[PDB]
Write a protein that binds this ligand. Sequence first.
Ligand SMILES: C[n+]1cn([C@@H]2O[C@H](COP(=O)(O)OP(=O)(O)OP(=O)(O)OC[C@H]3O[C@@H](n4cnc5c(N)ncnc54)[C@H](O)[C@@H]3O)[C@@H](O)[C@H]2O)c2nc(N)[nH]c(=O)c21
Ligand SMILES: Nc1ncnc2c1ncn2[C@@H]1O[C@H](CSCC[C@H](N)C(=O)O)[C@@H](O)[C@H]1O
Ligand SMILES: [Zn+2]
Ligand SMILES: [Zn+2]
Lengths: 121, 291
Amino acid sequence: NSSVLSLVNFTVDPQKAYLDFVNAGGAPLTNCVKMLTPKTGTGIAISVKPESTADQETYGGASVCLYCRAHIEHPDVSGVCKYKGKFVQIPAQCVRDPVGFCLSNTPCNVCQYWIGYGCNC
Amino acid sequence: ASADWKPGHAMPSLFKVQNVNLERCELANYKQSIPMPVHMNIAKYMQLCQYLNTCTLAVPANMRVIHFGAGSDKGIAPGTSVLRQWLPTDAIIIDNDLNEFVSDADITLFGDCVTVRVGQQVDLVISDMYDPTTKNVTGSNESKALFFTYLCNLINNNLALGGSVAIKITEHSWSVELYELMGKFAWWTVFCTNANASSSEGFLLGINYLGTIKENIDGGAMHANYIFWRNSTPMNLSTYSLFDLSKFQLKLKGTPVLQLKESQINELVISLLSQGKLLIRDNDTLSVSTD
Ligand SMILES: C[n+]1cn([C@@H]2O[C@H](COP(=O)(O)OP(=O)(O)OP(=O)(O)OC[C@H]3O[C@@H](n4cnc5c(N)ncnc54)[C@H](O)[C@@H]3O)[C@@H](O)[C@H]2O)c2nc(N)[nH]c(=O)c21
Ligand SMILES: Nc1ncnc2c1ncn2[C@@H]1O[C@H](CSCC[C@H](N)C(=O)O)[C@@H](O)[C@H]1O
Ligand SMILES: [Zn+2]
Ligand SMILES: [Zn+2]
């Protein structure tokens, strides 16, 4: 943790820096805050309350945000984090690297499910 | 095994009314851990929340919740996220810790809790604070000051009538003054989660603040009663209560917030306060900053 977190402070593209690190064998960021949930949710990517389906796990949003975890500027032109204060659903097969998954994907702009993991548009 | 499916154990009046010396706490399963599927504090906080689901908590719109001791040595705040999952979506969470962390709170303040200046009154105080030096046990187990001085003043000044508190204590991390302040609530207990049953930890609960003395409590004797209870009560580690979470979220009670002068507080108002049906405090915008 304290290494990959240290790494993404030595680069201009923290998203690419993290992904290249874990794509080359780096240990994913640990200690993401996994919640216990009734697997009866809608399955959207980001939600005010947990929304995991039986195929998903829910995390506290700040804990899966690279920018929150590394204490660096968020890239949102709004300056407001998309995850913090909310909950984020991750496909269950991807719990090994929740942060890597979030950096690697984008919720659907119309249906709010993960593109390729729920979006049916 | 009924109790295994409960979120934990609450101190019964059987032990509240005893009168005994303060003895050493000796738990049979001391420091045994239960495996989690997930940080242990997830299950601890959810069990506390489940028990508070059985209490007459006031649950207004724009509920004001402050969470002290929210950080971990990992830089995250599992308890705050549980509070986010539990509380109404429009609840305001302010959390605080000595050390840096990141959380799903609305407002996060670093530094000693004493630097946390609350301009208004809040509706719910959660404290998980514990000072590392309490581990240096030398001599008598005496009432502690530490952050309890701050919390006691908070209860007396910055807590709405009808508001509640849940404050972590242990065998050695405890305060005579805080126990005595439980006598200013409609009801009080100590709640011990099943997930951490092997610890002398308990959450001292004051339910529905009344601002006036309802029960005269000898705080030193009451801590001796709490330890006598722990020493007398087998508690099996368990998270069975988290197997069914269909009703985990705090009920959306729409509790009203009223402004009232002290002299207007009649018997009707006290009854409503004591039932979780009313809060008395400002309806301004909340201001919680570091000083
Ligand atoms: C109850 N108890 C206390 N002691 C002895 O008395 C000392 C102080 O006792 P305590 O008041 O710390 O209570 P306890 O040991 O039950 O607390 P525990 O470690 O479970 O800590 C509870 C919570 O305090 C906080 N905490 C503990 N340590 C720290 C820390 N170092 N920094 C921040 N928070 C901490 C955490 O939230 C933790 O979950 C113990 O360290 C031990 O020598 C016992 N010894 C035996 N043999 N059997 C016991 O049952 C027993
Ligand atoms: N005086 C004080 N002001 C603010 N935080 C304090 C404090 N004294 C102790 N603490 C905090 O008490 C915390 C106890 S452990 C907190 C665990 C946290 N609730 C979780 O969910 O993991 C420690 O982080 C410690 O820094
Ligand atoms: Zn963020
Ligand atoms: Zn879509």
